[PDB]
Write an enzyme that holds these catalytic residues in place. Structure first.
Site, PDB file in Angstrom:
ATOM      1  N   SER A 134       0.858  -1.191   0.000  1.00 44.81           N
ATOM      2  CA  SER A 134       0.000   0.000   0.000  1.00 44.81           C
ATOM      3  C   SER A 134       0.891   1.237   0.000  1.00 44.81           C
ATOM      4  O   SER A 134       1.634   1.433  -0.977  1.00 44.81           O
ATOM      5  CB  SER A 134      -0.993  -0.115   1.157  1.00 44.81           C
ATOM      6  N   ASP A 145      -9.547  -4.102  -5.457  1.00 42.37           N
ATOM      7  CA  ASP A 145      -9.013  -3.149  -4.494  1.00 42.37           C
ATOM      8  C   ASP A 145      -9.887  -1.902  -4.445  1.00 42.37           C
ATOM      9  O   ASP A 145     -10.055  -1.209  -5.454  1.00 42.37           O
ATOM     10  CB  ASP A 145      -7.575  -2.784  -4.862  1.00 42.37           C
ATOM     11  N   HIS A 185      -7.700  -5.350  -0.986  1.00 37.84           N
ATOM     12  CA  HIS A 185      -6.509  -4.554  -0.711  1.00 37.84           C
ATOM     13  C   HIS A 185      -5.588  -5.237   0.292  1.00 37.84           C
ATOM     14  O   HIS A 185      -4.369  -5.030   0.254  1.00 37.84           O
ATOM     15  CB  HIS A 185      -6.916  -3.171  -0.200  1.00 37.84           C
TER      16      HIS A 185
END
Ligand code: NA
Ligand code: NA
Length: 262
Positions: free
Chosen positions: A133, A179, A211
Site C-alpha cells: 500500500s 481493491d 486490498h
C-alpha cells in the site's frame, strides 16, 4: 558460453519448491528496536542460517497506512528461506505518507549494511525494496531516487504521484482486482504504464483479491516475489521460467503484463 553466475544460491527451482511454505534455506531472526533504529521504527531481520554458499542480497519491506510490522511479517521467512536477508520495518508513525516511507526503506538498508549484526552475510551492492500500500508507494519513490537498487516490488501500491518515468530499477507491481482502497485503475496500472520502456517491469493482478491480500500468506505473491528477486537481485536466470504465465491457466491471476528489455 555465458560466464557462470556467482550469485546463484540454492538448488534448481521448480514450481513446487516456489509454491511451498518454506525454501531450501533455514532462517534465523534478530530484532531491531525502534529507538536504536536511526531513520525508521525498528523491525526484524530474517537471514539464512548457513553462509557456506556466499553472501546474499538484502531486501527491505515496508507496511502500509496504520499498519505495523506484523501485517507483512509473513514475507520475512518466506523470502529469506530462498537465500535473502530480509528486514521487515516499522515506520516512525503509523500515518507516514509514501514519500516518508521511502526514506525509511533506505535507512533500513543502510542499517543492514553498516550497523546490523548480519552485515557480514549481506552483499552491499545487491539490495532491493518492497512495500504494501503506502509502503508500495514508498517502494516506487525509493527506486526512483536510488537507481543502484536491483529490484522493487510494490504490493497493491498507493501514491498520489502517478509519474514514475525515471525508475531504472526492475519493478514488479502486484495489484488486487477488487481493491477499493488503492484501486488499480488509478494506482497500480497507471504506475506500471508510467514506468520507462527500457526498464524491466511486470504487472500482476490478483483475481478477485482485496486490498489486504498481501497481509496474509499468498502463494501467488510469494512465488512471483521470489522469482523477481532471484532474477534481478541475484541475476538468476533459472527463475525466468516463472515470469511468463498465462492468466487463463491460473485462477489466482486475472491479468499479467510484462516487458523485458534485457
Ligand atoms: Na527510530
Ligand atoms: Na485467471
Amino acid at each position: 558460453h555465458m560466464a557462470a553466475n556467482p550469485y546463484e544460491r540454492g538448488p534448481d527451482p521448480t514450481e513446487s519448491s516456489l509454491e511451498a511454505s518454506s525454501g531450501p534455506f533455514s532462517v534465523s531472526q534478530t530484532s531491531v528496536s525502534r529507538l536504536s533504529a536511526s531513520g525508521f521504527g525498528g523491525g526484524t531481520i530474517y537471514y539464512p542460517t548457513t553462509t557456506s554458499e556466499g553472501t546474499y542480497g538484502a531486501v527491505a519491506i515496508s507496511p502500509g497506512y496504520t499498519a505495523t510490522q506484523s501485517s507483512i511479517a509473513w514475507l520475512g521467512p518466506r523470502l529469506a528461506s530462498h537465500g535473502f536477508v530480509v528486514i521487515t520495518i516499522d515506520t516512525n508513525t503509523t500515518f507516514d505518507q509514501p514519500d516518508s516511507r521511502a526514506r525509511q526503506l533506505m535507512a533500513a538498508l543502510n542499517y543492514l549494511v553498516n550497523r546490523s549484526s548480519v552485515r557480514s552475510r549481506i552483499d552491499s551492492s545487491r539490495l532491493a525494496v518492497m512495500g504494501h500500500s503506502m509502503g508500495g508507494g514508498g517502494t516506487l519513490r525509493a527506486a526512483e531516487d536510488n537507481p543502484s537498487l536491483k529490484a522493487a516490488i510494490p504490493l497493491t501500491p498507493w501514491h498520489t504521484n502517478k509519474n514514475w518515468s525515471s525508475v531504472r530499477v526492475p519493478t514488479l507491481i502486484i495489484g488486487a482486482e477488487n481493491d477499493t482502497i488503492a484501486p488499480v485503475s488509478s494506482h497500480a496500472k497507471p504506475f506500471y504504464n508510467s514506468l520507462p520502456s527500457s526498464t524491466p517491469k511486470a504487472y500482476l493482478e490478483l483475481n478477485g483479491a482485496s486490498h489486504f491480500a498481501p497481509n496474509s500468506s499468498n502463494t501467488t505473491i510469494g512465488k512471483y516475489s521470489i522469482a523477481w528477486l532471484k532474477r534481478f537481485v541475484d541475476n538468476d536466470t533459472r527463475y525466468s521460467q516463472f515470469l511468463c504465465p498465462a492468466p487463463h491457466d491460473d485462477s489466482a491471476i486475472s491479468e499479467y503484463r510484462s516487458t523485458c528489455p534485457y
